[PDB]
Amino acid sequence: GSSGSSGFRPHFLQAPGDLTVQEGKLCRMDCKVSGLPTPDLSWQLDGKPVRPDSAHKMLVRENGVHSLIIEPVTSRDAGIYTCIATNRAGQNSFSLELVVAAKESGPSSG
Structure with missing residues (x-):
């Protein structure tokens, strides 16, 4: 019947x-x-392909669910993460913001 499959x-x-x-x-x-x-999505930081490293860890479930964990976190981590999900049907994208407050460096012991 349908040339392809449900999507x-x-x-x-x-x-x-x-x-x-x-x-x-x-x-x-x-x-x-x-x-x-299965809609494939890619992470992008500041108009660049972000790759998973010792700090950046990308998760991939068997239901399409995705997650991007970072640790430790640097000041450069703050920006606009643009992800684009492309599926056999079409393609979509979204924008987001991330604020990073510097540490309270001081002569005090925290």
Whole structure:
């Protein structure tokens, strides 16, 4: 029948926004995308392909759910993460902001 198989455009059900994390802290991110057979999304930081490293850890579930964890967190981590989900149906994207408050460096012991 249908040349291909059932498939719907990539739609982000739950998208993040503007979070705040003090430098040297844990930064977790959650995002759900609907689509079939499986909408592939890529992370982008400041118009650049962000790659997972000892600090940046990308998660991939078997339901399309994705997450980007960072630790420690630097000042450069703050910016606009633009992700683009492309599925056999179509393609989608979204924007987000991340605030990072520097550490309280001082002669005091915290």
